[PDB]
Amino acid sequence: AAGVAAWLPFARAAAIGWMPVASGPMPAPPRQERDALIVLNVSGTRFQTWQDTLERYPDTLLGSSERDFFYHPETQQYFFDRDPDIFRHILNFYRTGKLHYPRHECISAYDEELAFFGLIPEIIGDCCYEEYKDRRRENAERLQDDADTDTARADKRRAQKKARLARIRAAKSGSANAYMQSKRSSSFETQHHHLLHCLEKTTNHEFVD
Amino acid sequence: AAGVAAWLPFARAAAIGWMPVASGPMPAPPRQERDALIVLNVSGTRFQTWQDTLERYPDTLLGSSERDFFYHPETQQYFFDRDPDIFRHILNFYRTGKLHYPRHECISAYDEELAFFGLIPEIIGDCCYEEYKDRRRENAERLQDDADTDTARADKRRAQKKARLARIRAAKSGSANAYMQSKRSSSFETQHHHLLHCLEKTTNHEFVD
Amino acid sequence: AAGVAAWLPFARAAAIGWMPVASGPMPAPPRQERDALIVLNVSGTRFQTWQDTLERYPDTLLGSSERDFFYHPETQQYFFDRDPDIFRHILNFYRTGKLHYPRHECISAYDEELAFFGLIPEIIGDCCYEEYKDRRRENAERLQDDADTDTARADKRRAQKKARLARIRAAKSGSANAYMQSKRSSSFETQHHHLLHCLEKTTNHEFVD
Amino acid sequence: AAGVAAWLPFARAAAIGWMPVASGPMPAPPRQERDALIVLNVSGTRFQTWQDTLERYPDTLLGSSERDFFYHPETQQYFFDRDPDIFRHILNFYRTGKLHYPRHECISAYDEELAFFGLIPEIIGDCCYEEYKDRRRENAERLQDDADTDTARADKRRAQKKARLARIRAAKSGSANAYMQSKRSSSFETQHHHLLHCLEKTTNHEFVD
Amino acid sequence: PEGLEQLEAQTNFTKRELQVLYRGFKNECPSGVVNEDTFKQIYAQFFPHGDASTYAHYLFNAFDTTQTGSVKFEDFVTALSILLRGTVHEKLRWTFNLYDINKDGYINKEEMMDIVKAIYDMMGKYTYPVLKEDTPRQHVDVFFQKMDKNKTLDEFLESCQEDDNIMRSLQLFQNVM
Amino acid sequence: PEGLEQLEAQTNFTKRELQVLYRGFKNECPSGVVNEDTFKQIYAQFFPHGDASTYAHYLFNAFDTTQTGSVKFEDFVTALSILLRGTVHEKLRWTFNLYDINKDGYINKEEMMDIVKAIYDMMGKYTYPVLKEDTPRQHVDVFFQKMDKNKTLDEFLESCQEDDNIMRSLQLFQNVM
Amino acid sequence: PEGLEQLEAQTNFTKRELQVLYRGFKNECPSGVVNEDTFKQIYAQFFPHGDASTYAHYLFNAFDTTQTGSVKFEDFVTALSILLRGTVHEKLRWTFNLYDINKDGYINKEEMMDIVKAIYDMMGKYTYPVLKEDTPRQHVDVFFQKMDKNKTLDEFLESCQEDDNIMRSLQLFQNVM
Amino acid sequence: PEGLEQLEAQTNFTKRELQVLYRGFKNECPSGVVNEDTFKQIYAQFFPHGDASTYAHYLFNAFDTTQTGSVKFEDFVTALSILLRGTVHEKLRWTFNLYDINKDGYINKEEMMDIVKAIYDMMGKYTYPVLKEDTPRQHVDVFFQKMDKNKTLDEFLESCQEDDNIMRSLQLFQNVM
């Protein structure tokens, strides 16, 4: 496979044993092109790895043409805006082949990085996989309790869900009030209010308090 | 909202559907100005993030005119003198929108960084919020037991409170003795002793042992 | 021993007391050669230590001629492709002499770094050695349960072992199918398929679906 | 005190209120000299802090003339060869005034850094001080059990103590054998063997196997 | 899905613009594909007065060519380019297909009843005229009064090109992003 | 609250001085506003012989304009600038308002009884004369012997300007920080 | 075990090539020595159609000079250099010793029965001719038809040098790594 | 305890040498002072054949001026400088005080019985002559045969200066560190 790629000269040397008992057909070696270590700057922290280390798993974000989206050219480095202390385990996977789970990291943030970088929770090593499954089970139970649809430890969960909904409604009302204040008299706020003005004046209707 | 600000071209493209069924009023687009990643050096460790990432929450320290107080100009970077391993979660909040709680970090220091940078314990994500509340409850119980006003596990708490008060009194006595020794015969110590001399000689009274 | 090597001038000064009660034989001092701190870049994170600190344990990877394999010359630094947050404990061992065990790190990855850098689980300090042994025992029990040879908490272990075997078989089938597709019509993939072609055409046989 | 030193202009402004009700004696202000942030490179990881931050506690290693021993001049930085992830809490103490205890760090290594840098376990904050005392108690019990003087969970402790003594004896025998081999036919090894030769030939006696 | 394939190669975005768009896209949906639910979650944040889910459904259906179920980055970017920096013909066809709910291309005053209904419903109930139950029907009727001659795509194109006001409103956002 | 608004724009602090002051201020109270309790905690550290809480209360009341309850950074900095590097008139008005406990501006030998009492009490009981119960009253009496002609702000200003010794003692700290 | 000792000093690898080889070698077996089991684990990954363990056993025995039990880095690298970039004579002796299972150097159509059997078995059962039980014997028989004159090392060398096709196939991999 | 105070100011170590010595010293005893127990722990590592604790006790007593109990860095460094790079007179006085166990300065063949006994005992029992119970007494007797004329400090100094061999052996370590 591609995981053991540094042992390609080993396999080629082993293939020499076939030649005496073969009938030389001119198997046409591919005649490849010919290795400086590259930098992955995950929000300030630089991680230096050989490109061949990343290319050995060409179905994820790091080994792909996908990382050309995150190449920042004038600094000659790949800048990701992700967690610096979880990308370490991504590189550790790319080096060996088995993911490790941090016992001290939130599993809802660990899964986010795995989803981002293309890894899957099926390749995490057996050494730390019972605890990963246990914490995933706890997170799933929390989600299920939070999504029991009670509209008409779980009691405080429902209370905090109601508080979160109230906060979302308050944020929506604050955005509407800010737009109203702007109409009466930031960077993105101006464009958002322009969009709201366009929505207003395409239907000859006006927002009021 | 401002959280989904990178989807502004998406919203503008969606707004094209209104134009056929509209009555073009010349809605006057704002004609904005026009993105290099900026550095946040939190006591040695540099954290590189786009300015637009910070500006999407313009009610905290990082997204504000407040961080102009912490700009260190000749190095062209923002230098904060805070914890390097807790500002990581501040940036993770600024990227997604949900705070994460370190299970391995003291909650009295985690709350300090949240208070400093303008975040609130109400926006921390639901994934790790039961444990944050539990540890906050333990800290509050510790504070309440330490502040039961017994002047006339809790026994050793009272003992360490008395020891701390004795240490504070010893520090005060040592400062007074140091001032006395200076009067008989550091950088800040000279100015502090000058202030004490001013207090002495504004009331024609002298401190003695 | 070599652990207390900075106290060599101390031992030489102590040896002066022997001279009065001696019979000077001209003991022929070795007349040594004569100390800049060197850099160990473990995948992005640089660790600066004096060379004499590493040379005091000349039976491991860091104190040896073995690290000349990992010297990257044009940058004048040693580049290791290992875990950045576990090599810290390797340096802490080289400074004092006792290894420390991270309670938050997987023991199957901690042992990997010890095996890589030449250290042994026999030199880890007594301060954290009961927990290291306990976690090693849990890992060994996991391995034994996973290797009980049931071919015909342990139930889910057998289930995940069967799933892993199925995934390995699927990967083998996918590699074979990829080679078949290449024959019908990456970097390492071309050389691997050339090797497979050589194996095919040394026995005048062809792989088919 | 010196902890609140950035509030010296505050105290000087407060002292203005005394002047109207005073009798101006010309209190002779000290006329001080007049602040660039300095670097503390603790084995690769640089920590940048203002010098005034360190000078506010002038009875420890960092705020003292003692750190002039660790100044590395040509790089214009202070290089310490200590733990990079524990010096963070030293700086956090220097910033606020209260030490924090890492729940994930060995207490025998945490106390080592406190002893090195001059801090004491009496100033660690009340927020994390019950757990620090608990872990110190466990370490003390481990030491007491290991030092029960049984020469003639505790059983395995005695077994590992005997194994450690056997390893020490084996190391001594190996050093003696290495010296013997050198006499029959590294850097520090040559000087150590020269010292052993001096000890031999000051008493006209020779070491033999 | 290369970065150079969707460069200025019938996609009107530069390399830096493509990189910024991919960063923003993968920030919300790391999997690289966005579904209808997440589509609505982002769309409803820009318009908090009401609910834009009804309009976001038709918007996603327009974006999701071939009705795959989830829209990936390549077709997302080409749709954005067509809508923002595309030509008149492409924008008008995209809008026509957005209104054209069914497979065949027709507009019958019932297919786009829902479009105008959603456009009005994504404002909530806080406007000055307090809206009305029959105002979307009036808007649709006055819309049909300028293009529907007798009872199509050619009619839509010619009607849009005849009136310069919709012309000058379509290219509002191509100058700024 | 901008950094440039409170620059040398009737605030006598430079940009670097403002940055240092904000760093030191937010080090103790990260919220950006300091209340009476924390005010006393910092103030009592400089004078460990006695308790400065009594004087710190009046000092906070002088700092806390409009009696909001907690003093923020902007008014804190302008008060510091007025006291340290301000002019004579501003310093004298600030001191007069510090002594003037009540709303209207008057001094009646009872309002500033507490001021001198706190100034003497913030020394503890360790001085050479061992103090006395009636020495603050004597200090207040000798203070009133040089400005109180018959029985105000104008009187305070003219008395302070008449004697050059208070003049040269007020500007003690403007040269050094 | 120095890095300079196994440099271009009868080892055909440069300093950078040795560094890369050591990095790759220690990545899989950090102890610096690789045993038969790990040998088979790496070898079987390159040929997933069948099992290469049978051939990997003889390959390890050829690599493991003096039958120590585990092969270290120095002899591993010298074997790789001999096989890849070595001369004809060294390659032919190495292959002869690979076929020569026993101690003394002889080939008797039974020692290398297993070699050809493993070479055919490492393809699985998916080939076009569906193989056969007697095809390895036919391959061995046709192999013996070109070198076995009457019933050795000299015979193997002269037979290999007589036919230029095996000559040109042996040096296939020296140009590329 | 400054770094510049113990510079080349009657201390024969440079700034870099002082920094290296302090780093090595604080590596073992972070408190900045080393006691007798730790003294023995470092001293016994250099001589593993026997036990050097008996000699390390007298060595610590010589180092620990004024019998404080624990020796700090300043006096440790000045003792090292005197012994290694010091002059003849200082080295001879230091050795005499090392032998002089009691307060007053005298040598009576019983005070230094322990010194030679420890020097012989720090070799263990593995030497070629297998040592003897009376060989330290013979060494002391032959030592007294060259300086003890009748039955002191002046005698020790003159005896050491008379024989050039001890002279040339004393300065063995000043050239190398």
Residue numbers in the entry:
A (entry chain D), B (entry chain A), C (entry chain G), D (entry chain C): 2 to 35, 40 to 157, 418 to 450, 472 to 495
E (entry chain F), F (entry chain B), G (entry chain H), H (entry chain E): 36 to 186, 191 to 216
Publication excerpt:
Modulation of voltage-gated potassium (Kv) channels by auxiliary subunits is central to the physiological function of channels in the brain and heart. Native Kv4 tetrameric channels form macromolecular ternary complexes with two auxiliary β-subunits—intracellular Kv channel-interacting proteins (KChIPs) and transmembrane dipeptidyl peptidase-related proteins (DPPs)—to evoke rapidly activating and inactivating A-type currents, which prevent the backpropagation of action potentials. Here we report cryo-electron microscopy structures of the Kv4.2–DPP6S–KChIP1 dodecamer complex, the Kv4.2–KChIP1 and Kv4.2–DPP6S octamer complexes, and Kv4.2 alone. Thus, our data suggest that two distinct modes of modulation contribute in an additive manner to evoke A-type currents from the native Kv4 macromolecular complex.
